[PDB]
Design a protein around this ligand. Structure first.
Ligand SMILES: *[C@@H]1O[C@H](CO)[C@@H](O)[C@H](O)[C@H]1NC(C)=O
Ligand SMILES: *[C@@H]1O[C@H](CO)[C@@H](O)[C@H](O)[C@H]1NC(C)=O
Ligand SMILES: *[C@@H]1O[C@H](CO)[C@@H](O)[C@H](O)[C@H]1NC(C)=O
Lengths: 25, 49, 96
């Protein structure tokens, strides 16, 4: 399955559960 | 025999996921839909209205 | 010309706002501006020095206030989303 430099008020909030924590689950 | 069958099935899942590129269609489709919506939202700033 | 500092640049009447940095993009002789998907100016050619500068906007982000209940306590913590801690506004800049 496949950081964007959008400066028009668009932002991507990081997920609370990191990929490491999901892998630990 | 059952253990060998289970191991071979897991190996075949490994191979099918590695080879076929469109195996993860659903997640890629979700990502593409979100990215396309964001791109359309950005591109809407170029129109005069 | 002021680089690496957020300024209210006015390039031939462009009257934009952002921080100017040296750009490696090669403008053709007949073009003086560079836009993007949102049709906002991204790179400009200096009318005097004839150099290409990238217009990226000033560091912006949301402010999230981490607080317990007011009946519980009064202290709060502030989260600056997608902002490095090295960024230090000494003067008043928007929030707080
Ligand atoms: C004066 O005009 C020339 C011609 O474009 C330019 O090369 C030069 O940089 C200008 N002077 C200054 C101080 O920028
Ligand atoms: C929350 O506020 C109410 C009314 O202000 C108060 O009675 C209650 O004790 C508070 N909760 C805590 C945990 O202090
Ligand atoms: C913040 O800046 C420091 C040094 O300038 C760098 O090492 C670090 O990776 C940066 N953090 C982020 C999230 O960009």
């Amino acid at each position: 399955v496949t950081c964007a430099q959008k400066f028009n008020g668009l932002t991507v909030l990081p997920p609370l559960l990191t990929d490491e924590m999901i892998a630990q689950y | 025999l059952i253990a060998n069958q289970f191991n071979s099935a897991i190996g075949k899942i490994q191979d099918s996921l590695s080879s076929t590129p469109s195996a993860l269609g659903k997640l890629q489709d979700v990502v593409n839909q979100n990215a396309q919506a964001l791109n359309t939202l950005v591109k809407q700033l170029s129109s005069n209205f | 010309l002021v680089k690496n500092k957020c300024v209210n640049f006015n390039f031939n009447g462009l009257t934009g706002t952002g921080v100017l940095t040296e750009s490696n993009k090669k403008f053709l002789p007949f073009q003086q501006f560079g836009r993007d998907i949102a049709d906002t100016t991204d790179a400009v050619r200096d009318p005097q020095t004839l150099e290409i500068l990238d217009i990226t906007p000033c560091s912006f982000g949301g402010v999230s206030v981490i607080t317990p209940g007011t009946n519980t306590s009064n202290q709060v913590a502030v989260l600056y989303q997608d902002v490095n801690c090295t960024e230090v506004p000494v003067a008043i800049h928007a929030d707080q």
